[PDB]
Amino acid sequence: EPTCNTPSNRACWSDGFDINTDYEVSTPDTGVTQSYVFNLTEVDNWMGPDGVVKEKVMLINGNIMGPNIVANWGDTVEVTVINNLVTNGTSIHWHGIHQKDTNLHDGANGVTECPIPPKGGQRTYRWRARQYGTSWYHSHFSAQYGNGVVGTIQINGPASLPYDIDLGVFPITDYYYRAADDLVHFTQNNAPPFSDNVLINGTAVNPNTGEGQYANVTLTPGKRHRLRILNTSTENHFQVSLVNHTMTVIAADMVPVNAMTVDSLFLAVGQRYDVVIDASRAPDNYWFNVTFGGQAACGGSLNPHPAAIFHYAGAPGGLPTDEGTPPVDHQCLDTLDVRPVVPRSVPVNSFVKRPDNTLPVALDLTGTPLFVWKVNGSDINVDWGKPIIDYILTGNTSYPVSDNIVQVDAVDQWTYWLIENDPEGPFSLPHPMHLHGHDFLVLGRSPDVPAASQQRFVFDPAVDLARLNGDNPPRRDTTMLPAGGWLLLAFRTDNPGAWLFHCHIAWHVSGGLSVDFLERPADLRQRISQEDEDDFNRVCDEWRAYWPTNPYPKIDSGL
Ligand SMILES: *[C@@H]1O[C@H](CO)[C@@H](O[C@@H]2O[C@H](CO)[C@@H](O[C@@H]3O[C@H](CO)[C@@H](O)[C@H](O)[C@@H]3O)[C@H](O)[C@H]2NC(C)=O)[C@H](O)[C@H]1NC(C)=O
Ligand SMILES: *[C@@H]1O[C@H](CO)[C@@H](O[C@@H]2O[C@H](CO)[C@@H](O[C@@H]3O[C@H](CO)[C@@H](O)[C@H](O)[C@@H]3O)[C@H](O)[C@H]2NC(C)=O)[C@H](O)[C@H]1NC(C)=O
Ligand SMILES: *[C@@H]1O[C@H](CO)[C@@H](O[C@@H]2O[C@H](CO)[C@@H](O)[C@H](O)[C@H]2NC(C)=O)[C@H](O)[C@H]1NC(C)=O
Ligand SMILES: *[C@@H]1O[C@H](CO)[C@@H](O)[C@H](O)[C@H]1NC(C)=O
Ligand SMILES: *[C@@H]1O[C@H](CO)[C@@H](O)[C@H](O)[C@H]1NC(C)=O
Ligand SMILES: *[C@@H]1O[C@H](CO)[C@@H](O)[C@H](O)[C@H]1NC(C)=O
Ligand SMILES: *[C@@H]1O[C@H](CO)[C@@H](O)[C@H](O)[C@H]1NC(C)=O
Ligand SMILES: [Cl-]
Ligand SMILES: [Cu+2]
Ligand SMILES: [Cu+2]
Ligand SMILES: [Cu+2]
Ligand SMILES: [Cu+2]
Fold first, then answer.
1. Using an 8 Å Cβ cutoff, are 154 and 70 in contact?
2. How does activity depend on temperature?
3. How far is CA 520 from CA 88, 332, 389, 499, in A?
């Protein structure tokens, strides 16, 4: 807990810890543990926030979202996940949390663990809060998170700008009436549907019936407010703005950034932004608009105007009067203008394109189903009953092709990755690429052009090497792979483990769009504790015993 974090000095936290401290290598010892219990239940004919009854949902503790985890920088968070679903297994992934030397607690089923069996199966996740900011959690059992197994994480720590009130979490998500397994099945042979609605902090109004409620945020006149915006969607990529107000970015994902004032912000699936809103305008109700750019290349909604109300305290009630001007089209791309407070520097002149640093993404339509996404010639398909960690604990190096293992043996060195977005394919779509266990550096991408143009770019050293940035580029866990283009990333090999690198669009990862970075295998085995190993084997023995009794088959990648 803090000793010097005041509304005038958010930069200070405690003795020897501040905004300037390198959080990746230095963590405060608090000795405090914040514990929670996640009871997953399967509810049929559930009444949703917009009035429409959902066929089936999978909730945590009976609510639309799980409890918002709150702890301080340096604490340990512990969660006992109890699976009371009927047929489905589960695994909770702590998106944003690096799991430094705790790979076995990542929640990546078929990689770091076997799924927790239903009908009462349990497992206790435990991890250290070595990072401060806004993150989230979700299931990784195929597209199970689309049914409601989602929630937020707020690890308190210092900030890059002073503020008065911390308004907390603001998760924006797409909402479908059809269940996730039905949607994965539809997307296997058809183009993805637009969302039925878009929920903002758990609620939205039905554009047809008028039922529901708009999310209502009360701003205090003349005060600076911190808002933690999240995109917890399965496909929808958002654009956000507040009429007559600007937003000052103080963090991108779980990485603190220097103040950057904007009119609107693009949020890819899995992306987060901590912003400061100054209630500097006239007392009235203002609309917080959720819009779409990229000409529907990265999503859409059947609700033409998803919005929230930002009410000034003292002002009258009702709905806002000003509709405002439409925001600029972000073209399905996140901003590369954000510069981290704690800097990093890497050489970019030395990069050479080789098969071992290149990851070509492609859409294979030559099989059954039609929509099969491949990375380097293979669609990922993990084995829930024999995860990558089982191979490590037995000394087996015969990993099947389908696991998409990319073994990185480099010890604490910066590794380079060029991701290619099907430049020779019939068409290309933008993809929100996410990396487990690390924060990557966004070194550069193909020139920003309209997301629906179909303009293709292949990495040319003669012009693209000068377009790269190695002098403190954006550091985060999720960024956009441009349509028909390319993306150059770099991460330091400081965390031995099996880490997934995938597109966060549920339908795509289901279709196989992922690779598994097996980082320093030899170091990983030696760093696995007897408690972690014993428990992993307990859960795998229980899952392998349950599987033959399951009346349903695995229809996708399992991720
Ligand atoms: C996890 O639990 C869910 C919910 O029970 C399971 O989803 C259900 O899966 C079945 C079989 O895939 C679906 O029925 C099938 O639907 C297809 C498409 O319409 C149809 O062609 C088949 O004849 C069959 O009727 C069912 O609709 C679906 N339910 C929901 C709400 O999505 C899922 O299979 C379980 N996952 C695992 C691996 O255990
Ligand atoms: C931000 O969100 C608000 C609230 O959802 C948007 O306000 C809505 O604006 C639309 C027009 O763009 C209004 O609907 C339209 O009404 C006309 C009436 O003649 C009709 O012909 C159209 O077919 C359409 O239905 C709507 O009444 C209004 N919502 C309310 C209740 O105030 C606003 O446009 C959004 N602003 C931006 C820049 O995204
Ligand atoms: C993508 O697959 C290709 C082919 O399977 C890999 O290319 C081979 O890489 C090894 C290791 O460097 C070389 O010894 C071979 O000569 C390469 N074969 C080719 C295509 O000439 C490539 O490494 C894979 N990419 C990644 C990053 O996994
Ligand atoms: C989970 O919740 C259900 C319904 O609320 C209840 O029946 C069950 O006992 C709970 N399981 C545990 C162990 O909390
Ligand atoms: C989000 O909704 C919750 C309702 O559970 C509310 O307590 C919270 O204040 C809302 N967030 C803000 C500050 O808008
Ligand atoms: C929003 O909440 C505030 C605080 O209670 C209130 O003043 C206002 O009337 C509410 N607006 C709506 C549309 O409910
Ligand atoms: C290694 O793992 C494979 C699974 O891909 C299994 O078929 C094989 O029997 C194992 N061999 C060893 C080393 O025991
Ligand atoms: Cl992560
Ligand atoms: Cu995630
Ligand atoms: Cu993740
Ligand atoms: Cu994708
Ligand atoms: Cu993942």
1. yes
2. Optimum temperature is 60-70 degrees Celsius.
3. 32, 34, 13, 11
Closest to 149 in 3D by CA, of 61, 269, 259: 61
Q: Which one of 286, 305, 322, 325 would you pick to mutate in the ligand 2 pocket, going by the greatest count of ligand atoms within 8 A of its CB?
A: 305
Residues 485, 457 contacting (CB under 8 angstroms):
yes
Residues that place a CB less than 5 A from ion ligand 10: 95, 436
Q: Judge if the beta carbon of residue 203 lies within 6 A of ligand 6.
A: no
- Which CATH code is given to the segment(s) 343-559? 2.60.40.420
Check if 1-158 and 343-559 are the same fold: yes
Phi, psi of 541, deg, nearest 5: -65, -40
Q: Kindly report the CATH class assigned to 159-342.
A: mainly beta
- The neighbouring-strand residues paired with 81 are 38, 123
Domain 1-158: CATH superfamily, name plus number: Cupredoxins -  blue copper proteins (2.60.40.420)
For residues 208 and 301, the answer to whether their CB atoms sit within 8 Å is: no
- The finding on whether 122 has its CB within 6 A of some atom of ligand 4 is no
Closest atom, ligand 4, to C-alpha of 40: 1
Q: How far apart are the first and last CA of the chain?
A: 36
HSE of 250, CA atoms in CB hemisphere, 13 A: 27
Closest ligand 5 atom, residue 169 Cα: 11
Domain ranges of the chain: 1-158, 159-342, 343-559
Q: In this structure, which ligand is nearest to the CA of 440?
A: 8
The CA 95 to ligand 8 mean position distance, Å, reads: 4
**Shortest CA distance to 417 belongs to which of 336, 341, 503, 359?**
359
Report the residue among 36, 44, 84, 116 best suited for mutation to probe ligand 4: largest number of ligand atoms under 8 A from its CB. 84
